[PDB]
Amino acid sequence: SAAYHIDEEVGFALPNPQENLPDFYNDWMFIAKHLPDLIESGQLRERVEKLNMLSIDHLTDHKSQRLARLVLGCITMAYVWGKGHGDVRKVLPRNIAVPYCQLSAALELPPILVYADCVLANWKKKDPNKPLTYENMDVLFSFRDGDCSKGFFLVSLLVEIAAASAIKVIPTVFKAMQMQERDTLLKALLEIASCLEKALQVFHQIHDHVNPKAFFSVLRIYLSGWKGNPQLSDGLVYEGFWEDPKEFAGGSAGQSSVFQCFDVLLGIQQTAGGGHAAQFLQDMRRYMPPAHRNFLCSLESNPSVREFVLSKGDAGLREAYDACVKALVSLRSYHLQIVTKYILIPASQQPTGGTDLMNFLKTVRSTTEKSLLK
Numbered sequence: 128s129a130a131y132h133i134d135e136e137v138g139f140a141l142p143n144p145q146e147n148l149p150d151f152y153n154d155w156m157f158i159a160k161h162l163p164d165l166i167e168s169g170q171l172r173e174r175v176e177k178l179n180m181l182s183i184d185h186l187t188d189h190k191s192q193r194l195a196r197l198v199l200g201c202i203t204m205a206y207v208w209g210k211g212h213g214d215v216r217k218v219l220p221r222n223i224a225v226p227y228c229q230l231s232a233a234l235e236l237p238p239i240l241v242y243a244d245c246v247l248a249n250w251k252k253k254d255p256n257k258p259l260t261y262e263n264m265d266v267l268f269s270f271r272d273g274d275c276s277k278g279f280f281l282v283s284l285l286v287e288i289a290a291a292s293a294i295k296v297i298p299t300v301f302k303a304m305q306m307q308e309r310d311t312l313l314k315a316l317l318e319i320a321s322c323l324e325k326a327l328q329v330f331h332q333i334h335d336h337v338n339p340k341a342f343f344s345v346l347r348i349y350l351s352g353w354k355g356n357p358q359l360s361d362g363l364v365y366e367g368f369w370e371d372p373k374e375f376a377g378g379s380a381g382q383s384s385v386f387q388c389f390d391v392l393l394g395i396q397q398t399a400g401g402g403h404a405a406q407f408l409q410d411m412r413r414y415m416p417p418a419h420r421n422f423l424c425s426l427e428s429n430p431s432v433r434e435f436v437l438s439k440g441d442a443g444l445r446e447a448y449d450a451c452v453k454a455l456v457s458l459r460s461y462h463l464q465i466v467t468k469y470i471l472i473p474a475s476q477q478p479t480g481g482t483d484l485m486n487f488l489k490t491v492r493s494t495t496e497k498s499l500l501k
């Protein structure tokens with residue numbers, strides 16, 4: 128749906144992201160485009176600290192604000208984490224923190240790099256006349272040489288793009304229920320499951336483009352936040368904007384709207400409960416663009432697909448409904464192998480609670496498989 132900033136082609140991802148800010152913002156852009164060099168040489172913090180404060184007034188459209196959020200988000204992670212080996216900063220200087228906080232308040236996102244910045248808005252086609260394939264795409268920003276950010280961001284992006292093909296069927300589903308069109312609804316469900324199965328294959332590409340040590344020991348350090356982090360146990364001081372430090376979670380992949388989109392579509396009850404899984408999942412919506420926050424809530428408000436399928440004593444409908452449910456399980460099962468490869472093992476070889484992170488993921492999967500109708 129157009130009202131919810133959902134693209135037919137790229138889904139939750141931002142269509143054709145802007146690459147240039149107005150010349151007014153060059154001092155930001157130059158720092159962001161040169162993070163690998165500036166961090167390596169140990170100059171990044173000096174360059175940030177001698178920035179003047181630039182007003183956000185000259186950002187004139189949504190895409191401009193998205194790019195500015197990406198630029199400032201990347202500079203922030205780099206400033207806080209520096210070279211990525213424990214020498215941190217607890218005060219984001221006034222001349223970044225104030226405009227970053229104002230912009231974030233206008234976009235209804237927290238002042239930290241999130242998935243919608245470093246993945247959904249961080250990309251370009253190399254040649255626009257060619258399709259959305261890895262070898263024709265690129266990211267706009269990276270942190271360090273050899274951080275594998277192009278691989279992680281683009282493959283996450285390509286999964287979002289694959290899911291878009293299922294997302295665009297969702298309106299067909301609800302109207303089918305409202306028009307009592309049994310065959311249309313069944314075809315629609317099968318199509319969604321098929322597209323979700325194609326999204327699972329896209330996920331396999333991460334092995335070709337992301338290397339585990341680089342991810343765990345470099346990229347993951349720059350995507351880390353300051354909520355419950357002993358390195359910044361009190362959060363980050365956004366100097367000149369809030370007096371006391373604030374805590375925000377790191378820009379994980381867990382901020383995608385794709386799994387939750389189909390959770391609520393299928394009536395899978397992840398957000399219900401007091402447990403640590405519901406709270407974490409519901410907390411992650413805070414980090415999704417407000418338009419996508421609204422989309423998930425609208426879906427939660429429409430009549431239940433699950434109640435519809437169970438009401439009709441239709442084996443065809445249940446089997447198609449289940450095909451969607453299983454594809455969602457398969458995604459989470461595969462995603463679990465990915466976390467094992469890219470976090471658990473590299474951590475075990477010395478450096479992510481380990482077991483408490485896995486049970487969370489296993490819980491969400493288990494909750495998902497329990498929803499099968501059989």
Ligand code: HEM
Nearest residue numbers: 282283286287379380381383386387459465466469470491
């Ligand atoms: C190297 C690849 C990846 C790693 C290491 C990774 C890591 C993680 C981690 C650690 C969590 C637990 C919560 C947290 O981050 O604190 C998580 C959950 C999650 N991840 Fe990823 N992720 C990766 C790729 C992806 C991709 C590509 C997607 C989506 C396209 C994704 C979607 C999710 C979702 C939705 C959750 C929340 C749990 C759920 O909905 O079932 N992840 N991931």
